[PDB]
Amino acid sequence: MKIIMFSVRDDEEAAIREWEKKTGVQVDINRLELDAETAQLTKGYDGIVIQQRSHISNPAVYETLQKNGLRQLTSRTAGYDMIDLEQASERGLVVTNVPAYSPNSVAELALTQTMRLIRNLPLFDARGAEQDFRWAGLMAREIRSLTVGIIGAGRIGGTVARLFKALGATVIANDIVERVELKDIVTYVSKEELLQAADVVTLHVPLMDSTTQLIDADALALMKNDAVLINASRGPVVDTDALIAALQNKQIAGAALDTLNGEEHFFNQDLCGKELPSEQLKVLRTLPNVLITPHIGFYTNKAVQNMVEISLNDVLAILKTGTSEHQLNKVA
Amino acid sequence: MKIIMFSVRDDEEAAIREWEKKTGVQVDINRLELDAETAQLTKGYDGIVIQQRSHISNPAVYETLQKNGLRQLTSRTAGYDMIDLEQASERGLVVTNVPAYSPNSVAELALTQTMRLIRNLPLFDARGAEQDFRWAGLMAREIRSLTVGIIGAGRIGGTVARLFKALGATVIANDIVERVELKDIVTYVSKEELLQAADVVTLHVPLMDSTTQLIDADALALMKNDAVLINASRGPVVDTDALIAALQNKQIAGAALDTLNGEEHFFNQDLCGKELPSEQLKVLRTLPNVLITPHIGFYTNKAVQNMVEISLNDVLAILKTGTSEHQLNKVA
Numbered sequence: 273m274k275i276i277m278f279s280v281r282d283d284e285e286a287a288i289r290e291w292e293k294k295t296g297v298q299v300d301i302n303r304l305e306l307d308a309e310t311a312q313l314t315k316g317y318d319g320i321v322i323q324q325r326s327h328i329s330n331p332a333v334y335e336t337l338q339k340n341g342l343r344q345l346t347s348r349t350a351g352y353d354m355i356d357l358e359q360a361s362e363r364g365l366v367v368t369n370v371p372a373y374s375p376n377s378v379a380e381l382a383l384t385q386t387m388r389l390i391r392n393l394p395l396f397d398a399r400g401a402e403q404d405f406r407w408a409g410l411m412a413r414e415i416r417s418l419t420v421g422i423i424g425a426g427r428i429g430g431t432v433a434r435l436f437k438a439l440g441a442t443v444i445a446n447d448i449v450e451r452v453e454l455k456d457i458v459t460y461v462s463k464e465e466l467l468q469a470a471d472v473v474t475l476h477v478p479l480m481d482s483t484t485q486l487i488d489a490d491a492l493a494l495m496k497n498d499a500v501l502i503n504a505s506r507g508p509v510v511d512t513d514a515l516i517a518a519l520q521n522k523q524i525a526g527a528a529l530d531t532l533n534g535e536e537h538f539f540n541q542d543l544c545g546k547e548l549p550s551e552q553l554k555v556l557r558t559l560p561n562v563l564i565t566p567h568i569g570f571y572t573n574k575a576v577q578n579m580v581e582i583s584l585n586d587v588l589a590i591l592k593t594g595t596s597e598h599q600l601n602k603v604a
Numbered sequence: 605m606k607i608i609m610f611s612v613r614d615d616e617e618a619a620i621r622e623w624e625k626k627t628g629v630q631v632d633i634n635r636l637e638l639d640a641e642t643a644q645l646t647k648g649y650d651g652i653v654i655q656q657r658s659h660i661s662n663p664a665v666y667e668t669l670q671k672n673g674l675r676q677l678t679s680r681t682a683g684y685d686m687i688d689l690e691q692a693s694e695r696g697l698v699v700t701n702v703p704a705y706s707p708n709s710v711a712e713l714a715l716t717q718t719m720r721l722i723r724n725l726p727l728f729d730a731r732g733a734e735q736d737f738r739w740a741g742l743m744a745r746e747i748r749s750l751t752v753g754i755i756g757a758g759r760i761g762g763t764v765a766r767l768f769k770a771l772g773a774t775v776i777a778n779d780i781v782e783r784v785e786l787k788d789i790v791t792y793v794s795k796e797e798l799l800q801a802a803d804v805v806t807l808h809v810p811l812m813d814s815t816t817q818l819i820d821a822d823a824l825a826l827m828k829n830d831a832v833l834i835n836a837s838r839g840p841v842v843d844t845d846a847l848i849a850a851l852q853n854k855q856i857a858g859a860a861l862d863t864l865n866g867e868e869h870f871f872n873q874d875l876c877g878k879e880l881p882s883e884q885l886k887v888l889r890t891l892p893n894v895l896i897t898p899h900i901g902f903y904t905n906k907a908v909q910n911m912v913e914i915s916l917n918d919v920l921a922i923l924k925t926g927t928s929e930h931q932l933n934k935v936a
């Protein structure tokens with residue numbers, strides 16, 4: 273038995289071949305995408321796994337698969353928006369995703385980013401660019417003496433607290449629901465209390481109408497002038513404009529942004545001396561106190577492995593059983 | 605009682621005054637370093653404490669300090685290097701320092717700078733200045749998925765391990781004496797086992813005829829090619845030409861330096877516009893994967909206040925007691 277995998281990265285390769293071993297299933301990789309040309313490559317295969325943003329329209333695809341008799345179309349990413357569920361449905365194609373990869377990936381990036389700001393490192397690095405090596409006024413703090421606010425103590429949000437609690441810090445959290453598992457880890461508080469008490473605020477909530485622009489300028493108002501803002505979740509959870517405003521005015525210390533508003537038109541593109549599409553991107557990259565990362569929180573050996581492992585196991589289940597825990601569709 | 609304090613900084617003032625308040629002992633300050641007419645500066649004062657690099661061999665201070673009634677000379681840093689041993693014990697002058705201030709200051713810097721590197725942040729940042737927002741090739745690693753080598757698991761060395769331990773790292777150490785307190789937290793290995801097994805290699809030893817060039821041409825060629833080195837201890841510890849040759853030739857992946865060869869002559873000075881003393885420093889600033897900080901490991905609220913409290917309670921001891929912990933010398 274064998275699976276074909278598309279659009280495979282060089283960093284995914286280690287993880288696939290570990291799973292090839294484990295299950296004794298043979299998997300074949302290529303660097304293509306799925307289009308009606310390349311669908312013909314499914315010929316000798318019992319199933320397929322893809323990765324891409326490209327919306328796949330042409331019914332010749334779902335036909336061709338069904339014609340070589342694949343019973344599913346699997347995506348290793350969280351998003352399915354490029355697969356047409358109806359089209360899969362009528363072709364006897366069950367389509368699955370991989371929503372949850374290791375919550376540690378993002379977490380340790382929240383940690384790294386935070387520590388840097390805590391040590392005042394971007395300012396050292398600035399001074400030291402010009403060979404001012406003086407340390408005047410840059411005295412920093414120890415984590416045990418910090419109180420870390422977490423909004424959305426989640427799968428991730430929860431992992432984050434656990435990290436910091438372990439480092440010796442003091443962890444408070446704002447959440448609409450309390451987990452008992454976090455009982456010795458966070459003290460639960462209202463958003464208004466957290467913002468007031470917290471040296472570091474880190475946003476782990478999902479992006480909903482509920483949470484969109486949860487950080488509004490009166491929430492930034494509420495924060496300590498020397499406190500920092502860490503957003504690893506989703507760009508729109510934050511008011512990009514109020515952020516900038518607060519920063520300039522020194523309402524808060526600085527920030528780490530892994531995700532920004534309007535990033536679909538910048539992160540993961542070669543902008544090298546093209547022009548920047550976001551006036552905010554342009555204004556934030558000119559702020560000294562602010563770090564930015566291309567929504568790479570996820571991107572780690574163990575996280576890539578999950579997407580590789582899970583997405584493949586979903587392929588097996590559909591084949592042996594006919595059902596996967598991750599399936600988004602029906603057939604007839 | 606009253607005590608004169610020297611070379612004081614803005615960061616120290618708040619921590620000092622709190623002590624004055626606490627003990628009712630009056631400490632008068634100044635940004636002066638102790639040299640010559642600074643002798644009588646001790647006039648009304650019953651004790652003196654200093655923070656400086658500049659050495660003092662001249663007896664026209666010591667007799668003054670004897671006559672002015674000062675029974676001691678106390679340093680607020682761990683360094684005693686600038687003090688005379690003959691003149692001290694004979695002039696009526698005891699000499700105490702602070703051997704250890706908060707160990708988490710230094711530990712947490714190496715944890716930060718390590719985490720930064722594990723996450724490929726310098727390469728990401730480098731790309732983001734080009735406005736190249738692509739993440740392809742930058743995959744990072746989880747802490748659990750790493751083996752952290754500690755050379756010198758001492759006060760600081762051992763704090764580092766507990767940390768990386770808590771965050772789930774497999775942690776191995778190298779020391780000439782093994783603490784039982786670390787039996788559970790670490791696995792003791794030899795230097796050559798360590799350099800070969802570990803992804804992160806962090807140095808905690810003191811500068812000694814023994815440790816000087818512990819990381820040498822050979823030690824570096826032993827390390828994983830994907831590994832990183834973190835030197836938070838002392839410049840001489842690493843053979844800096846070898847380190848450069850090794851980053852240059854990609855023998856290791858990156859490095860993080862809080863101390864460098866001959867730092868006394870560059871670190872903590874505004875060299876903006878001036879030429880750099882070490883070609884060693886010149887060259888290291890152009891290597892991508894390398895991170896340099898001006899010996900800011902110690903520098904945090906707790907560690908500063910530690911220095912101040914301790915040193916003054918070393919003085920009030922040698923007055924209200926006649927003896928103190930960290931003193932080394934005899935009498936007339």
Ligand SMILES: NC(=O)c1ccc[n+]([C@@H]2O[C@H](COP(=O)([O-])OP(=O)(O)OC[C@H]3O[C@@H](n4cnc5c(N)ncnc54)[C@H](O)[C@@H]3O)[C@@H](O)[C@H]2O)c1
Nearest residue numbers: 378424425426427428447448476477478479504505569570
């Ligand atoms: N950094 C990356 O590369 C990327 C990858 C993984 C996760 N994502 C993001 O991180 C977040 C992940 O959420 P999750 O799967 O870890 O946990 P989760 O889905 O279990 O839910 C998160 C927590 O946030 C809480 N929250 C919801 N409403 C909020 C309310 N309005 N205010 C207070 N908090 C409430 C929820 O109760 C929940 O417990 C998402 O926003 C997701 O977009 C980032």
Ligand SMILES: NC(=O)c1ccc[n+]([C@@H]2O[C@H](COP(=O)([O-])OP(=O)(O)OC[C@H]3O[C@@H](n4cnc5c(N)ncnc54)[C@H](O)[C@@H]3O)[C@@H](O)[C@H]2O)c1
Nearest residue numbers: 756757758759760779780808809810811836837899901902
């Ligand atoms: N980064 C900063 O700003 C600054 C501030 C604090 C500490 N300092 C430095 O960090 C180090 C601190 O040492 P410490 O006080 O934390 O611990 P420590 O004084 O208790 O001793 C350190 C450990 O290193 C070990 N070591 C000694 N010889 C070495 C041998 N030759 N090879 C293997 N390891 C052996 C010792 O056994 C000891 O356990 C010093 O070098 C000091 O200079 C850095």
